[PDB]
Design a protein around this nucleic acid. Structure first.
Ligand code: MG
Ligand code: MG
Length: 133
RNA sequence: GUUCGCGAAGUAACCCUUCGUGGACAUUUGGUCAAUUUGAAACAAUACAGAGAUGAUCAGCAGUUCCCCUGCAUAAGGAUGAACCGUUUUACAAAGAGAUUUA
């Protein structure tokens, strides 16, 4: 376990030291947020992504990946509540809607998307958006 | 304890002493804290590692950090004060070609 313990500890010194110095460079956050996922600890990883939304919330690769780590282990109402916060923050975006729509397809629930497209049409988005509805 | 008044005692031209009493005067200090080993000074010495760039030797001045130290300091010094120079794979598709493959 010390063959493990000191591994995890030494990594969390190196990653934080760099992020300590560079608030930006999201490339590091996602990497380091991925490290804590592969240790099967969701609490730490969620903190990291939540810590990395403060730095920039306009960076969609970060938003998208933090949907993955929720969906991969199948924590539903988190990746569900998250999408409340996700598309209310950046309501214009394209990718964020479709990744919320297409993930609702594989959940087979068409009542959701019925009300989804209600709002997403209420927002008057544009051509390619309406055509999906 | 002082003073006012009263009530008694011995002496008493009513006063001095003595006793018993009513009232007034005066009215809530200090602790965030307990006296040596177990609620946290530091330095020196010893051993190990050695003080930026670059072919090599050097002057430095800044920036960034959930590092500080000497200094009256918003001056200036402290190795250019220190620490940092590592790691990096997905908003991701469009066209075509081969093969497997089912109503
Ligand atoms: Mg310096
Ligand atoms: Mg200096």
């Amino acid at each position: 376990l010390e063959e493990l313990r000191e591994y995890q500890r030494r990594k969390r010194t190196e990653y934080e030291g760099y992020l300590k110095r560079n608030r930006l460079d999201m490339g590091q956050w996602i990497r380091y947020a991925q490290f804590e996922i592969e240790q099967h600890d969701m609490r730490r990883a969620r903190s990291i992504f939540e810590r990395a939304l403060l730095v920039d919330s306009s960076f969609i690769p970060l938003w998208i990946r933090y949907i993955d780590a929720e969906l991969k282990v199948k924590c539903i109402n988190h990746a569900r509540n998250l999408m409340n916060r996700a598309i209310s923050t950046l309501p214009r975006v394209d990718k964020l809607w479709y990744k919320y729509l297409i993930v609702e397809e594989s959940l087979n629930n068409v009542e959701i998307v019925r009300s989804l497209y209600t709002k997403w049409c209420s927002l008057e988005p544009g051509v390619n958006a309406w055509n999906s509805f």
